[PDB]
A = this chain, B = another copy of it.
Amino acid sequence: ATYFTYYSAXKX
């Protein structure tokens, strides 16, 4: 499984 959070200006 792959999970992530991100911020680029806003998480599977």
Contacts and interface: CB of A to CB of B under 8 A. Distances in A.
Interface of A: 1-9
A1 B5 contact: no
A4 B6 contact: yes
A8 to B, nearest CB: 4
Contacts of A2: 6-8
Contact of A1 (B1, B4, B8): B8
A10 to B, nearest CB: 13
Given A3-B6, A4-B7, 7 more contacts: A1-B8, A1-B9, A2-B8, A3-B7, A4-B6, A5-B5, A5-B6
A3 to B, nearest CB: 5
